Amino acid sequence: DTKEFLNHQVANLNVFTVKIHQIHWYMRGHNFFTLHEKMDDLYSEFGEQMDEVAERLLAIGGSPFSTLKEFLENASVEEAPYTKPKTMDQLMEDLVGTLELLRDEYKQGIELTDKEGDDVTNDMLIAFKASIDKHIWMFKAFLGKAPLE
Amino acid sequence: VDTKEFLNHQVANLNVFTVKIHQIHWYMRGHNFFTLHEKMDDLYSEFGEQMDEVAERLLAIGGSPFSTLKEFLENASVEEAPYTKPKTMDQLMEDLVGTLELLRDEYKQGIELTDKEGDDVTNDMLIAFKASIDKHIWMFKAFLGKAPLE
Amino acid sequence: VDTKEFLNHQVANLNVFTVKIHQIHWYMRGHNFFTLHEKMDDLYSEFGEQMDEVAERLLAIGGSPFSTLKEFLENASVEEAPYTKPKTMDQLMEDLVGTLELLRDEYKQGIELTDKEGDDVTNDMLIAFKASIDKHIWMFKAFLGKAPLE
Amino acid sequence: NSVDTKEFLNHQVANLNVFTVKIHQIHWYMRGHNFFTLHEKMDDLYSEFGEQMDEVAERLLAIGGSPFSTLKEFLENASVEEAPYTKPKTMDQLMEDLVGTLELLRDEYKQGIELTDKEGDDVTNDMLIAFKASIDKHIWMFKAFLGKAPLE
Amino acid sequence: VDTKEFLNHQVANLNVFTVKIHQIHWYMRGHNFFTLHEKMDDLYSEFGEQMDEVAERLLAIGGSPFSTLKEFLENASVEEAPYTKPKTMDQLMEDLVGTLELLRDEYKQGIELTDKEGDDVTNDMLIAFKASIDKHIWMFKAFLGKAPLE
Amino acid sequence: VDTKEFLNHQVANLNVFTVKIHQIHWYMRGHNFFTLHEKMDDLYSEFGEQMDEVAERLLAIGGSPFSTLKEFLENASVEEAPYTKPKTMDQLMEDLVGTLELLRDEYKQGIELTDKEGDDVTNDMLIAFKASIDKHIWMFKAFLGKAPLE
Amino acid sequence: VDTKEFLNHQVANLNVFTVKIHQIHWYMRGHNFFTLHEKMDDLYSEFGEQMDEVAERLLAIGGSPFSTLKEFLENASVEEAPYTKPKTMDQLMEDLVGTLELLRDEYKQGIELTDKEGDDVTNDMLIAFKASIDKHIWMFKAFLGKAPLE
Amino acid sequence: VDTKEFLNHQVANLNVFTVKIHQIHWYMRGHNFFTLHEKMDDLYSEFGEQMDEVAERLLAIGGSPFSTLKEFLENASVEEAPYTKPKTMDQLMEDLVGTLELLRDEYKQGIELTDKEGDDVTNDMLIAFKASIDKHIWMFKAFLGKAPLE
Amino acid sequence: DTKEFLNHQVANLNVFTVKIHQIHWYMRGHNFFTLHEKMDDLYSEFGEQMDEVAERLLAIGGSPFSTLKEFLENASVEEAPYTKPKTMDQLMEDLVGTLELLRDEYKQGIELTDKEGDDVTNDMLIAFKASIDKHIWMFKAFLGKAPLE
Amino acid sequence: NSVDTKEFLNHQVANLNVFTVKIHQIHWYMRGHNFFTLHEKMDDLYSEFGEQMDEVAERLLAIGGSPFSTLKEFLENASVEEAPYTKPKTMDQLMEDLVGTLELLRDEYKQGIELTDKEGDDVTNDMLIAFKASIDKHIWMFKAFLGKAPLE
Amino acid sequence: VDTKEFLNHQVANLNVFTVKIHQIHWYMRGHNFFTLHEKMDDLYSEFGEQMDEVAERLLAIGGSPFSTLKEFLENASVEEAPYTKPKTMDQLMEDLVGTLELLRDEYKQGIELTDKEGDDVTNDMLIAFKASIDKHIWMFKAFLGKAPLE
Amino acid sequence: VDTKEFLNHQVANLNVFTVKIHQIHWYMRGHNFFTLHEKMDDLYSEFGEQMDEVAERLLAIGGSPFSTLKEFLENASVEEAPYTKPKTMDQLMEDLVGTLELLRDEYKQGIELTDKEGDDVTNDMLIAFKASIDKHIWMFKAFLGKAPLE
Ligand SMILES: [Zn+2]
Ligand SMILES: [Zn+2]
Ligand SMILES: [Zn+2]
Ligand SMILES: [Zn+2]
Ligand SMILES: [Zn+2]
Ligand SMILES: [Zn+2]
Ligand SMILES: [Zn+2]
Ligand SMILES: [Zn+2]
Ligand SMILES: [Zn+2]
Ligand SMILES: [Zn+2]
Ligand SMILES: [Zn+2]
Ligand SMILES: [Zn+2]
Ligand SMILES: [Zn+2]
Ligand SMILES: [Zn+2]
Ligand SMILES: [Zn+2]
Ligand SMILES: [Zn+2]
Ligand SMILES: [Zn+2]
Ligand SMILES: [Zn+2]
Ligand SMILES: [Zn+2]
Ligand SMILES: [Zn+2]
Ligand SMILES: [Zn+2]
Ligand SMILES: [Zn+2]
Ligand SMILES: [Zn+2]
Ligand SMILES: [Zn+2]
Ligand SMILES: [Zn+2]
Ligand SMILES: [Zn+2]
Ligand SMILES: [Zn+2]
Ligand SMILES: [Zn+2]
Ligand SMILES: [Zn+2]
Ligand SMILES: [Zn+2]
Ligand SMILES: [Zn+2]
Ligand SMILES: [Zn+2]
Ligand SMILES: [Zn+2]
Ligand SMILES: [Zn+2]
Ligand SMILES: [Zn+2]
Ligand SMILES: [Zn+2]
Ligand SMILES: [Zn+2]
Ligand SMILES: [Zn+2]
Ligand SMILES: [Zn+2]
Ligand SMILES: [Zn+2]
Ligand SMILES: [Zn+2]
Ligand SMILES: [Zn+2]
Ligand SMILES: [Zn+2]
Ligand SMILES: [Zn+2]
Ligand SMILES: [Zn+2]
Ligand SMILES: [Zn+2]
Ligand SMILES: [Zn+2]
Ligand SMILES: [Zn+2]
Ligand SMILES: [Zn+2]
Ligand SMILES: [Zn+2]
Ligand SMILES: [Zn+2]
Ligand SMILES: [Zn+2]
Ligand SMILES: [Zn+2]
Ligand SMILES: [Zn+2]
Ligand SMILES: [Zn+2]
Ligand SMILES: [Zn+2]
Ligand SMILES: [Zn+2]
Ligand SMILES: [Zn+2]
Ligand SMILES: [Zn+2]
Ligand SMILES: [Zn+2]
Ligand SMILES: [Zn+2]
Ligand SMILES: [Zn+2]
Ligand SMILES: [Zn+2]
Ligand SMILES: [Zn+2]
Ligand SMILES: [Zn+2]
Ligand SMILES: [Zn+2]
Ligand SMILES: [Zn+2]
Ligand SMILES: [Zn+2]
Ligand SMILES: [Zn+2]
Ligand SMILES: [Zn+2]
Ligand SMILES: [Zn+2]
Ligand SMILES: [Zn+2]
Ligand SMILES: [Zn+2]
Ligand SMILES: [Zn+2]
Ligand SMILES: [Zn+2]
Ligand SMILES: [Zn+2]
Ligand SMILES: [Zn+2]
Ligand SMILES: [Zn+2]
Ligand SMILES: [Zn+2]
Ligand SMILES: [Zn+2]
Ligand SMILES: [Zn+2]
Ligand SMILES: [Zn+2]
Ligand SMILES: [Zn+2]
Ligand SMILES: [Zn+2]
Ligand SMILES: [Zn+2]
Ligand SMILES: [Zn+2]
Ligand SMILES: [Zn+2]
Ligand SMILES: [Zn+2]
Ligand SMILES: [Zn+2]
Ligand SMILES: [Zn+2]
Ligand SMILES: [Zn+2]
Ligand SMILES: [Zn+2]
Ligand SMILES: [Zn+2]
Ligand SMILES: [Zn+2]
Ligand SMILES: [Zn+2]
Ligand SMILES: [Zn+2]
Ligand SMILES: [Zn+2]
Ligand SMILES: [Zn+2]
Ligand SMILES: [Zn+2]
Ligand SMILES: [Zn+2]
Ligand SMILES: [Zn+2]
Ligand SMILES: [Zn+2]
Ligand SMILES: [Zn+2]
Ligand SMILES: [Zn+2]
Ligand SMILES: [Zn+2]
Ligand SMILES: [Zn+2]
Ligand SMILES: [Zn+2]
Ligand SMILES: [Zn+2]
Ligand SMILES: [Zn+2]
Ligand SMILES: [Zn+2]
Ligand SMILES: [Zn+2]
Ligand SMILES: [Zn+2]
Ligand SMILES: [Zn+2]
Ligand SMILES: [Zn+2]
Ligand SMILES: [Zn+2]
Ligand SMILES: [Zn+2]
Ligand SMILES: [Zn+2]
Ligand SMILES: [Zn+2]
Ligand SMILES: [Zn+2]
Ligand SMILES: [Zn+2]
Ligand SMILES: [Zn+2]
Ligand SMILES: [Zn+2]
Ligand SMILES: [Zn+2]
Ligand SMILES: [Zn+2]
């Protein structure tokens, strides 16, 4: 149902923000500064997304996860500890991959909310998916690829 | 009931609601006086903007919104009570929460109705307003130490 | 009649006035639509804050202000008319000017009353409000091509 | 079978470009008592619908499409008609052309809402919903400027 | 007594008042710690600027304001108490309300005095300051669950 | 002399005053050039707003303010002197202070007149303006190392 | 006539111009009251800054600008008319446009003179001012439904 | 050729230029995507406002600017190419630099022409715009690792 | 040494921010709004502290933890999943407890950095400990207790 | 044995209060050519040292102390001398009193830096370091106003 | 001598000038310490931006600007003196005015040179810079009680 | 070497450093032109503030800072090179990183020296500046794809 999905996306968004901090810290290359501030922007944006999703889950009477243990236990986003220097394009491909994951899962949540008659969470997930899609186009354009490639 | 009648209905409901927000804004007393005072001012601004957007939307679809206190009291489904006997803060907050639940249910009915008639614009508008109303119900019900669905 | 009853009277008058300002804000049509639209928003904000300050001042002197639309309609001396048949821009501005003159005279009477009983605070407040209302009467009567005292 | 989303989005890119140029036409050639108010108003509308065009084009890019990027493609694919300014016109005439283009974009945007709702693209659906809301409000405002009902 | 002696007297009263506002600002404990903490900062700003305007106004009429703590303690009618044993929030708020009432009555006496000697400027100034003091008395007495005149 | 004639008189006085402020603004020379340059600009803005508000108030009471340099020179009681030989900073500041004293006394006469005829609005306005003028007299007389009376 | 005499001449012209802008600013009546009111204020600020910059430039080249209303009336070529009978909005706008044309032609003469004597600074300044004046002539002549030449 | 034909010609050139700026703004791919994306937005703002000022300046001198895409394509000397096959970042930047050089030379011709016919205003305007174009040519040619004149 | 301490405090600060979100979401009581915005302020502040600590660890050539697994494995701050409604005073006592923990550990880091001659990290930890001390006074004053009680 | 941190912090609370009142004294009774500049400057100094006093008192609360909160405690414990204004003084005189108080607070603040460094309270150490930095800069500025070296 | 060599010359002159502005900014003593302190900061910022724009303009025309202190000292025509024995405020201001006159004359020569070769961009830029420098010469020479051309 | 000599040494080092930052700011070419251009501007502002604070601190302790390019080149330990042959972006970034490492080591020596003499103020100042320098070394060494300690 909607509550399990919203909590699932809470965990996914927390792990996502931690990953955004990983790229924010370990990046090296010519595009260091631009993608550094860009990573800060992403941290703020997806943090606000996580806050709105969790408070929405509270609004519908649910209970969001509030510990790292619950996050790691329920998140479907994969995290990898940093062990050796990586290129900028690799970090951007991991970011784009997570963005595609959240795109698909958010779409499934849009269909689920549309069936269950929760138009609020439906519209919310629609807006979040819009921002995620725009970011997919931008970051896939950084890698010199089509948005559907 | 079609979309226009509902929009005017919510115009009256929102006006009476804002007047009530001023009632609590004025007659409140208690430990949480300042916080809920400025907070009531915030509610007045927010739902006043909601009322303006609803009325201008009703004008956009060629309707005619109610524009007098007589029409508001004649068509509103929100109950108002003149302040006579002193009331506690929790009482005023329970009246506020009650009206918020009323507007939540009615706004849901408006979302289904607009979804039926195919007016996606008013649908999305009522969706956003219902989002804000839900968040406020959670906040004020949490202030009273209660669950959002209680 | 004393100061408290007068302050409540002006609370009702100011509420009905703000509702009317929304009426013109919504139903106006003509070449000067945008200018008087934004201007009506400004008037709504200003006279709304006037109502808030008057009501909170009535609370400061230990009174109890009206807090429901029924009390407003029962105690207000400002007349409201539901919008039915289309009116011109100059007509709506003439109603606005009329209400402004009403609040001017009543506010003057309140200045005399507060000045007699020695309530200098409400005296100065009503003096400022009467200043703003006088300026608005000059401006809007100049819009209609008339003298401020005509 | 059914026309898809991308062709419609590009169509609205061209329509929005021609629209902005027309807004420049009224922005420059207007004369009358309401010169300043409708001048700054024309600037505001230009900013607003320019942002609409940019968002539509970037959304068309997001779904893997390619938006038109030349005046030739715009004039060849746009359904909004433009007229070069030759004889002096009144304020009401320019406002009637503006209102006409606004009604055109309103109807076409409605068709886009139905199409996006049909194909299941909820993002473009909501976006077109917002744009149609703004266009509806502007139709009410400018038709009220002409002393007319929003649906008249 | 004349205008200068009263204005300097209120300079001392306002200094002792601001110091007390810091006393509550520092030693307060309770559930309403943050709200009344920031509120105490606002009070410091307001009554401090009131003190500056009163002193510079006394300078404008050719007077000489007190400029040392000794003169303040020698001429102030506001009582200060060093903090020794812990007090509740309601106690500190009752002392604050007491000082606010003191300044209300004294400021009224200053309005009558300035009206008597014909200095209308200081009259209007004291009117505005007394207006703020009245509003604060209503708000803080509403925090204690009491009527503004009780 | 009634209120309208006085308000127009002060319109002319304020115009000539601002022109004089430009005279000092340009022909000043000395160590304190920058400070008194920006200060003269501040005075120009402030007294310009005073002149606009006074004239618009004169319109609010149904009067007709002077609107040409000829009428200003015809009714103004403030003296202007064309700049021919270089003057010191203290001289220009003494001319400024002198005009400030003139407007102080005349504005006080306006307070007595408006209070006598019962125009409380212009009374409060002129009270505020006289407050600002008094503060500026104290400031500039303190610049010259003199008591405000001064 | 050299550059200094021209700059002083335009100082007087700009002073009389701003005073006229206040004349229209106050005595205007009609449907477009608010728009042309704020617009007249904008013109007052803009041409006030032009007058300050022109006079300070005249000081920069070692000249001495006029600093009294008497000198302004003595050297200005812009005509002023005291307001006696009520005038329409189009009349005031035609006077404004007329003065704008006068300053346009004279400012062009100043461009030719400054370019001839080799003063490139005043050349560029007067070029910018003439640009603004030209744009305003187009705007206000478009308000009257006329071609800029128109 | 005269000033009006050149100004309209550059109106068309600037429109096609802004459309091309959107072409690169949308179809760009590479490591420098974000920096040159925001940079393309800045270019749109700058050259758009240049276009507005050029057109309104053409209006100020009594001309009639082009106001349709057909007139733009009929009179523009800037070449546009529909995007079909993918291009590199350096290619798009070389097309941008080419258009920038085109506008540089044409703008220089406009400076000579305006200086010839004696319109110093449009001369200075084209001087400023050409200054910006030169700075952008240096910056973007430095992006390609090339000399500004290469 | 300094690097191990800085990473340790990175984990502690991450778990801390997650806890601040827990109180931010599950709080109920009369002081709901004030402490809600206050919790937002704390999230921003300690997030900036964590960013500055991690980037400082990068400046001295260290490698900060960048996954929830590393955080949970190395953090010394205890987290508790929310299972039933709790009072405001309880949440404030947990917050104050974590603040005392970070106070003591930050003091130890000040002594360690002072011995090792790293005056930069020394001054940084001094400022952070100053803010933490002020917050301890404020929140302990909310509970009606002395700062040393 | 050794005097501790709390007594010093309270001492500086009283000193800072008396200092701010004195800054009000110069703020009001000043006359001279530099009236406006040193007037707004006196306001800036009042804000600055008021923030210093508030931070010192809240820091004293943070270490479990109790700051003085009455004028009686301030005058009884402050080491800064205040003088009621009786005869007119020049600008240089008021600036010499201000500079004197600034030097007093500089020296005492140095003693507080040594004491806090001794007892191991690094927080109050750094705070007093910042305050002493500001006081040093102001001593240089105001002694330069008097045409004197910062150490003269 | 051509345009590029002149632009580099003014780069060196502007760097040495900014360093001198810091010299007065640091070693000044006197009654006007604060005013000329902040003013020196303003001059440092302004003439620093002048240096940046001049150097980047030299880059735009394909030149190579000086980028080291050695090149600056070898090519600058502005004299610098290390501060050894104490100087008065008027002396430092006299050195500042002297350097301002130097940059005025050299900038004029650059206007003539750029005007001859047809570089209208650098011509207009140097015209603006000469305008600002002229204004500063008038202001600072007025500070010393002297005419701008004396 | 004591504290004053070190502070002056760092004044010279910081001035030569800022000049170098302008050198890279002007002569840079490559794909990362814009980002490192605005970034170089940021570095100029930051280290310029560092130089101002260091010099004013040296004045605070009674010292005399160097104030001429001759003194800077005579006492600075930072090497500058006039730009003759074209260099890559990575080369300029390696020179920048080298100078940053130089200032890091020297600032460390200053922290130890100030810690020895007991001047905690300059100690803390140099600590903050060294923090910023360390962060910048990490950032720019990460731009070059290198470890901060490489
Ligand atoms: Zn950002
Ligand atoms: Zn983003
Ligand atoms: Zn958050
Ligand atoms: Zn939140
Ligand atoms: Zn929240
Ligand atoms: Zn999943
Ligand atoms: Zn549904
Ligand atoms: Zn839907
Ligand atoms: Zn949405
Ligand atoms: Zn790549
Ligand atoms: Zn109904
Ligand atoms: Zn309670
Ligand atoms: Zn209120
Ligand atoms: Zn709020
Ligand atoms: Zn709310
Ligand atoms: Zn409204
Ligand atoms: Zn509205
Ligand atoms: Zn509206
Ligand atoms: Zn109902
Ligand atoms: Zn539908
Ligand atoms: Zn929506
Ligand atoms: Zn309760
Ligand atoms: Zn009309
Ligand atoms: Zn009309
Ligand atoms: Zn408005
Ligand atoms: Zn208004
Ligand atoms: Zn209200
Ligand atoms: Zn209120
Ligand atoms: Zn009644
Ligand atoms: Zn009545
Ligand atoms: Zn009419
Ligand atoms: Zn009466
Ligand atoms: Zn009309
Ligand atoms: Zn325009
Ligand atoms: Zn606008
Ligand atoms: Zn709009
Ligand atoms: Zn765009
Ligand atoms: Zn864009
Ligand atoms: Zn974009
Ligand atoms: Zn179509
Ligand atoms: Zn669907
Ligand atoms: Zn939506
Ligand atoms: Zn939407
Ligand atoms: Zn019409
Ligand atoms: Zn409680
Ligand atoms: Zn507040
Ligand atoms: Zn308050
Ligand atoms: Zn003060
Ligand atoms: Zn003051
Ligand atoms: Zn007494
Ligand atoms: Zn008393
Ligand atoms: Zn209680
Ligand atoms: Zn009275
Ligand atoms: Zn009287
Ligand atoms: Zn100022
Ligand atoms: Zn002033
Ligand atoms: Zn005005
Ligand atoms: Zn006005
Ligand atoms: Zn007005
Ligand atoms: Zn007279
Ligand atoms: Zn003197
Ligand atoms: Zn008043
Ligand atoms: Zn405007
Ligand atoms: Zn204008
Ligand atoms: Zn001026
Ligand atoms: Zn000026
Ligand atoms: Zn000036
Ligand atoms: Zn003449
Ligand atoms: Zn007309
Ligand atoms: Zn120019
Ligand atoms: Zn790359
Ligand atoms: Zn940018
Ligand atoms: Zn740009
Ligand atoms: Zn435009
Ligand atoms: Zn425009
Ligand atoms: Zn052509
Ligand atoms: Zn051509
Ligand atoms: Zn390349
Ligand atoms: Zn020329
Ligand atoms: Zn010519
Ligand atoms: Zn906050
Ligand atoms: Zn905080
Ligand atoms: Zn962060
Ligand atoms: Zn960061
Ligand atoms: Zn960072
Ligand atoms: Zn640990
Ligand atoms: Zn050490
Ligand atoms: Zn240390
Ligand atoms: Zn620190
Ligand atoms: Zn408790
Ligand atoms: Zn002097
Ligand atoms: Zn003051
Ligand atoms: Zn200041
Ligand atoms: Zn200061
Ligand atoms: Zn304080
Ligand atoms: Zn505080
Ligand atoms: Zn505090
Ligand atoms: Zn002591
Ligand atoms: Zn230690
Ligand atoms: Zn520190
Ligand atoms: Zn510190
Ligand atoms: Zn002296
Ligand atoms: Zn002096
Ligand atoms: Zn002097
Ligand atoms: Zn300044
Ligand atoms: Zn300057
Ligand atoms: Zn620079
Ligand atoms: Zn630069
Ligand atoms: Zn040379
Ligand atoms: Zn030379
Ligand atoms: Zn001198
Ligand atoms: Zn020559
Ligand atoms: Zn050395
Ligand atoms: Zn690359
Ligand atoms: Zn640059
Ligand atoms: Zn930046
Ligand atoms: Zn930086
Ligand atoms: Zn500096
Ligand atoms: Zn400085
Ligand atoms: Zn400084
Ligand atoms: Zn060295
Ligand atoms: Zn030591
Ligand atoms: Zn520090
Ligand atoms: Zn590289």
PDB file of N, CA and C in Angstrom, chain E residues 19 22 26 44 69, chain J residues 10-23 46 49 53 57 68-70 74 78 82:
ATOM      1  N   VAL E  19      17.592  45.998  32.165  1.00  0.00           N
ATOM      2  CA  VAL E  19      18.427  45.097  32.956  1.00  0.00           C
ATOM      3  C   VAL E  19      17.595  43.946  33.510  1.00  0.00           C
ATOM      4  N   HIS E  22      16.987  41.448  30.917  1.00  0.00           N
ATOM      5  CA  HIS E  22      18.105  40.515  30.839  1.00  0.00           C
ATOM      6  C   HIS E  22      18.086  39.508  31.981  1.00  0.00           C
ATOM      7  N   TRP E  26      18.007  35.563  31.167  1.00  0.00           N
ATOM      8  CA  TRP E  26      19.072  34.632  31.521  1.00  0.00           C
ATOM      9  C   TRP E  26      18.608  33.532  32.467  1.00  0.00           C
ATOM     10  N   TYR E  44      13.836  43.620  24.870  1.00  0.00           N
ATOM     11  CA  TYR E  44      15.052  44.409  25.038  1.00  0.00           C
ATOM     12  C   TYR E  44      15.218  45.396  23.895  1.00  0.00           C
ATOM     13  N   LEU E  69      24.965  54.585  35.793  1.00  0.00           N
ATOM     14  CA  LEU E  69      24.134  53.656  36.555  1.00  0.00           C
ATOM     15  C   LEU E  69      23.751  54.226  37.914  1.00  0.00           C
TER      16      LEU E  69
ATOM     17  N   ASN J  10      31.744  37.241  35.385  1.00  0.00           N
ATOM     18  CA  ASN J  10      30.785  38.173  35.973  1.00  0.00           C
ATOM     19  C   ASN J  10      31.376  39.574  36.075  1.00  0.00           C
ATOM     20  N   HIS J  11      32.640  39.661  36.498  1.00  0.00           N
ATOM     21  CA  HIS J  11      33.350  40.935  36.533  1.00  0.00           C
ATOM     22  C   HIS J  11      33.268  41.638  35.184  1.00  0.00           C
ATOM     23  N   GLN J  12      33.512  40.896  34.102  1.00  0.00           N
ATOM     24  CA  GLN J  12      33.427  41.480  32.770  1.00  0.00           C
ATOM     25  C   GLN J  12      31.992  41.761  32.343  1.00  0.00           C
ATOM     26  N   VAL J  13      31.006  41.065  32.912  1.00  0.00           N
ATOM     27  CA  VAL J  13      29.613  41.432  32.666  1.00  0.00           C
ATOM     28  C   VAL J  13      29.336  42.827  33.214  1.00  0.00           C
ATOM     29  N   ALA J  14      29.720  43.064  34.473  1.00  0.00           N
ATOM     30  CA  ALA J  14      29.542  44.388  35.068  1.00  0.00           C
ATOM     31  C   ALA J  14      30.323  45.449  34.300  1.00  0.00           C
ATOM     32  N   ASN J  15      31.596  45.164  34.003  1.00  0.00           N
ATOM     33  CA  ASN J  15      32.412  46.104  33.238  1.00  0.00           C
ATOM     34  C   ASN J  15      31.766  46.439  31.899  1.00  0.00           C
ATOM     35  N   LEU J  16      31.193  45.438  31.227  1.00  0.00           N
ATOM     36  CA  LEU J  16      30.599  45.681  29.916  1.00  0.00           C
ATOM     37  C   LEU J  16      29.314  46.492  30.027  1.00  0.00           C
ATOM     38  N   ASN J  17      28.531  46.274  31.085  1.00  0.00           N
ATOM     39  CA  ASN J  17      27.333  47.084  31.283  1.00  0.00           C
ATOM     40  C   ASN J  17      27.690  48.548  31.528  1.00  0.00           C
ATOM     41  N   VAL J  18      28.585  48.805  32.490  1.00  0.00           N
ATOM     42  CA  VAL J  18      29.026  50.174  32.743  1.00  0.00           C
ATOM     43  C   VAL J  18      29.625  50.781  31.480  1.00  0.00           C
ATOM     44  N   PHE J  19      30.343  49.969  30.701  1.00  0.00           N
ATOM     45  CA  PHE J  19      30.922  50.455  29.454  1.00  0.00           C
ATOM     46  C   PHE J  19      29.837  50.910  28.487  1.00  0.00           C
ATOM     47  N   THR J  20      28.802  50.088  28.299  1.00  0.00           N
ATOM     48  CA  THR J  20      27.728  50.458  27.382  1.00  0.00           C
ATOM     49  C   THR J  20      27.030  51.734  27.835  1.00  0.00           C
ATOM     50  N   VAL J  21      26.799  51.875  29.143  1.00  0.00           N
ATOM     51  CA  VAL J  21      26.195  53.108  29.643  1.00  0.00           C
ATOM     52  C   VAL J  21      27.089  54.308  29.338  1.00  0.00           C
ATOM     53  N   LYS J  22      28.408  54.152  29.508  1.00  0.00           N
ATOM     54  CA  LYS J  22      29.324  55.240  29.171  1.00  0.00           C
ATOM     55  C   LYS J  22      29.271  55.562  27.680  1.00  0.00           C
ATOM     56  N   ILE J  23      29.210  54.528  26.838  1.00  0.00           N
ATOM     57  CA  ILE J  23      29.064  54.725  25.400  1.00  0.00           C
ATOM     58  C   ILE J  23      27.795  55.508  25.112  1.00  0.00           C
ATOM     59  N   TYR J  46      27.994  50.503  20.698  1.00  0.00           N
ATOM     60  CA  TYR J  46      27.002  50.019  21.654  1.00  0.00           C
ATOM     61  C   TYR J  46      26.448  48.661  21.242  1.00  0.00           C
ATOM     62  N   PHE J  49      29.543  45.930  21.694  1.00  0.00           N
ATOM     63  CA  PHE J  49      29.853  45.562  23.070  1.00  0.00           C
ATOM     64  C   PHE J  49      28.636  45.046  23.824  1.00  0.00           C
ATOM     65  N   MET J  53      28.594  41.579  25.761  1.00  0.00           N
ATOM     66  CA  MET J  53      28.077  41.345  27.107  1.00  0.00           C
ATOM     67  C   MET J  53      27.094  40.184  27.133  1.00  0.00           C
ATOM     68  N   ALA J  57      27.631  36.735  29.253  1.00  0.00           N
ATOM     69  CA  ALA J  57      26.691  36.276  30.271  1.00  0.00           C
ATOM     70  C   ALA J  57      26.158  34.882  29.950  1.00  0.00           C
ATOM     71  N   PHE J  68      25.558  38.612  37.089  1.00  0.00           N
ATOM     72  CA  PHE J  68      24.882  39.723  37.745  1.00  0.00           C
ATOM     73  C   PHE J  68      23.763  40.252  36.857  1.00  0.00           C
ATOM     74  N   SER J  69      22.635  40.598  37.482  1.00  0.00           N
ATOM     75  CA  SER J  69      21.454  40.985  36.721  1.00  0.00           C
ATOM     76  C   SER J  69      20.788  42.236  37.282  1.00  0.00           C
ATOM     77  N   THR J  70      21.505  43.030  38.075  1.00  0.00           N
ATOM     78  CA  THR J  70      20.982  44.272  38.621  1.00  0.00           C
ATOM     79  C   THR J  70      22.063  45.339  38.539  1.00  0.00           C
ATOM     80  N   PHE J  74      26.253  45.412  39.308  1.00  0.00           N
ATOM     81  CA  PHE J  74      27.163  45.956  38.305  1.00  0.00           C
ATOM     82  C   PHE J  74      28.071  47.025  38.899  1.00  0.00           C
ATOM     83  N   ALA J  78      31.971  46.149  39.185  1.00  0.00           N
ATOM     84  CA  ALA J  78      32.676  46.589  37.989  1.00  0.00           C
ATOM     85  C   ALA J  78      33.966  47.312  38.355  1.00  0.00           C
ATOM     86  N   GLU J  82      32.839  55.224  35.982  1.00  0.00           N
ATOM     87  CA  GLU J  82      31.938  56.098  35.247  1.00  0.00           C
ATOM     88  C   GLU J  82      31.842  57.441  35.953  1.00  0.00           C
TER      89      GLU J  82
END
